[PDB]
Write a protein that binds this ligand. Sequence first.
Ligand SMILES: Cc1ccc2c(cnn2C)c1Nc1ccn([C@H]2CCNC2=O)n1
Ligand SMILES: [Zn+2]
Length: 140
Amino acid sequence: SGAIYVGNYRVVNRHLATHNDWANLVWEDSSRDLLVSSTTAQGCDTIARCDCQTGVYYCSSRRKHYPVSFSKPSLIFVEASEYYPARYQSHLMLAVGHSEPGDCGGILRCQHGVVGIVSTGGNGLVGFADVRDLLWLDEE
Ligand SMILES: Cc1ccc2c(cnn2C)c1Nc1ccn([C@H]2CCNC2=O)n1
Ligand SMILES: [Zn+2]
């Protein structure tokens, strides 16, 4: 679990969005595993606006943050697992690292701010849904 709180927006994995998120929806995209809902209180997170490929992510299944190198956002075939079927996911970045389903929502950050959230994994990889291209998160 986990979310990004930027301005009056809450960014979560689409497959973990609550009824309140869907009832206060701003934007959603099934191909990216992302959903953004509106919030009453303003949040403190800053979104990175950059092309970094190194950063740090939070892994809840280890209670640890790890430094990683990650690929630029791409359309990737995500393999099937014990818990979720195979599917194509766009705007996804991959790194070598540990992740389990409950790690979804952990933040990946670079020197410029939040880059994305954990969205895929297994087989020794962790995948993050990018948010750096959603420039509208910074306005209104
Ligand atoms: C982050 C990560 C890591 C390992 C992962 C997955 C999925 N199967 N494995 C081995 C994963 N992502 C997803 C995407 C959809 N989910 C469902 C599955 C049960 N709870 C969820 O949130 N998990
Ligand atoms: Zn950066």
